[PDB]
Design a protein around this nucleic acid. Structure first.
Ligand SMILES: Nc1ccn([C@@H]2O[C@H](COP(=O)(O)OP(=O)(O)O)[C@@H](O)[C@H]2O)c(=O)n1
Ligand SMILES: [Cl-]
Ligand SMILES: [Mn+2]
Ligand SMILES: [Mn+2]
Ligand SMILES: [Mn+2]
Length: 553
RNA sequence: GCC
């Protein structure tokens, strides 16, 4: 049937300058040495990406799908959702959002300037009146940082981002923001992934694992998911939205947004030229996460049913999927997973790597992360979330005139505090840098799901206790997989090995202790792993007085 | 670019 894209041959041009690394990286050249391996994806590679995502979709649904969609619509119908005022929507626009072509930006939008509010009213009127004219979008290459991998062909090409003008983005929120806050949870319940912190993700996967008489687990990811999403998938997303009770004005805007924007349209580069035409998901519109997550849930749950997965418990995050089910023996389990993949492929959600049954929770990876296990202060097993540190290490070394990597360090320290690589490497480096800068008590921003939170380094111990438990400060005897992977990643980026970080950590610890105050608590709590005379660590008062629930919505 |  449909191509995902067509192209005019016009290039995908840059936003402005694409930052160069420098001959000296003063914040990160004591963390690792192989700076050559660390690179940013640029618009030069946008052509290579285009080729790899332009292809013809043919989708074939069936009774399992139909049955699943039916049940999801019913679940949707228990949701009521409101329009947002034009003003509420303006004020959910992030502070640095790309400016409009009509001479105003996000500052004006957030402060409700008259010009801006005016334009947005006209845009909304035109949405309510015209349910048809395709709405033009800009296409840009995303800039992300990775570590070169020769096993996977050198350097990844940039992914493509497609979005409408700022004025339309605000209208999207008016129509659909309230739904994005409610529909996912209503349709998927406990399966909805973005509701959990690391420790909760872990606790959920463990409960799920323990409930089975004889468990089996697998993970799934769709190759180039946005480009596999069909016009029909998108219209089916509308039906799911429409199954909620909504003021009629929302219904009309939602429908018009679907037909003029979501199902497809023309794409312009940043130089203004016509670039191509799209008949798949624009990753850039408001409904990108909600849609990806819901359409993935629909297909996946259908696939489980097509393939005989018994007693599936799921966890879904965009196109990333884990299912833990009752094993039917390894012979049947392997056949079933092939059926699953076959069904998903029919549903136009083909895999990057074919999935595989597993029978040990450590070997299942999803959202680039996995559960692992260590021993706690009293010798009991302690389960926690970790990941390959390669990319976090690479981003820890992205330093330019306009980008400091310190926020990156902080974000990882908080998400992955119980990991051996955060504790020994990133924490040691982070504290060492800030002490020498004398900026320990200065606040930093922590980025997560589009939100930023001001955090003070001297509060890490409390935040960590709240978020991960007091055991995060006392875990030992990490697993073989985990020690192997960390050693290997440090070697690959030319970073000192763990032994050395242990020395550096003893020094950082002592400096912190000698400053007394909150700094000394950082020294005792965060670096107790680093000394022979291991102190007794007690619950922190400041911790009890703390609410971090919004951090992981 | 969006959650
Ligand atoms: N920076 C990102 C990354 C992913 N995504 C969305 O999530 C989808 C799945 O992402 P992924 O990480 O599995 O990579 P692909 O499946 O795109 O190759 C993408 O196709 C996008 O629609 C996004 O909107 N922005
Ligand atoms: Cl313990
Ligand atoms: Mn994918
Ligand atoms: Mn409609
Ligand atoms: Mn994915």
């Amino acid at each position: 049937s449909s191509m995902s894209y067509s192209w005019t041959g016009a290039l995908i041009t840059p936003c402005g300058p694409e930052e160069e690394k420098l001959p000296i990286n003063p914040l990160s050249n004591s963390l690792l040495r192989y700076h050559n391996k660390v690179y940013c994806t640029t618009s030069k590679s946008a052509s290579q990406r285009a080729k790899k995502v332009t292809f013809d979709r043919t989708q074939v649904l069936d009774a399992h799908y139909d049955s699943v969609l039916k049940d999801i619509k019913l679940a949707a119908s228990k949701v009521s959702a409101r329009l947002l005022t034009l003003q509420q929507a303006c004020q959910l626009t992030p502070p640095h959002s790309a400016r409009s072509k009509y001479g105003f930006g996000a500052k004006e939008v957030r402060s409700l300037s008259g010009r801006a509010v005016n334009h947005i009213k006209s845009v909304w009127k035109d949405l309510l009146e015209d349910p048809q004219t395709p709405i033009p979008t800009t296409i840009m290459a995303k800039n992300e940082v990775f570590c070169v991998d020769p096993a996977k062909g050198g350097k990844k090409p940039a992914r493509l981002i497609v979005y409408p003008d700022l004025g339309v983005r605000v209208c999207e929120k008016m129509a659909l923001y309230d739904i994005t806050q409610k529909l996912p949870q209503a349709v998927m319940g406990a399966s909805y992934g973005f509701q959990y912190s690391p420790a909760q993700r872990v606790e959920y996967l463990l409960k799920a694992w323990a409930e089975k008489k004889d468990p089996m687990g697998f993970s799934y990811d769709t190759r180039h998911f946005d480009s596999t999403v069909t016009e029909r998938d998108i219209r089916t997303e509308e039906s799911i939205y429409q199954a909620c009770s909504l003021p009629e004005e929302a219904r009309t805007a939602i429908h018009s947004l679907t037909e003029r924007l979501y199902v497809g349209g023309p794409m312009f580069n940043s130089k203004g030229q016509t670039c191509g035409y799209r008949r798949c998901r624009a990753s850039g519109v408001l409904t990108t996460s909600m849609g990806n997550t819901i359409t993935c849930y629909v297909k996946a749950l259908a696939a489980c049913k097509a393939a005989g997965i018994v007693a599936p418990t799921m966890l879904v995050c965009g196109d990333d999927l884990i299912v833990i089910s009752e094993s039917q023996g390894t012979e049947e389990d392997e056949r079933n997973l092939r059926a699953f993949t076959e069904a998903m492929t029919r549903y136009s959600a083909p895999p990057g790597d074919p999935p595989r049954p597993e029978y040990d929770l450590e070997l299942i990876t999803s959202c680039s992360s996995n559960v692992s296990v260590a021993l706690g202060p009293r010798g009991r097993r302690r389960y926690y979330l970790t990941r390959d540190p390669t990319t976090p290490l690479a981003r820890a070394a992205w330093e330019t005139v306009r980008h400091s990597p310190i926020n990156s360090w902080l974000g990882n320290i908080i998400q992955y505090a119980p990991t051996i690589w955060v504790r020994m490497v990133l924490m040691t480096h982070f504290f060492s840098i800030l002490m020498v800068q004398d900026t320990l008590d200065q606040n930093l921003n922590f980025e997560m799901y589009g939100s930023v939170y001001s955090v003070n380094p001297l509060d890490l111990p409390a935040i960590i206790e709240r978020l991960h438990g007091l055991d995060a400060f006392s875990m030992h005897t990490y697993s073989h997989h985990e020690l192997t992977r960390v050693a290997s990643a440090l070697r690959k980026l030319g970073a000192p090995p763990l032994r050395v970080w242990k020395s550096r950590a003893r020094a950082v610890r002592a400096s912190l202790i000698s400053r007394g105050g909150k700094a000394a608590v950082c020294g005792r709590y965060l670096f107790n792993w680093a000394v022979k005379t291991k102190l007794k660590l007690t619950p922190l008062p400041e911790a009890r007085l703390l609410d971090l629930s919004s951090w992981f919505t």
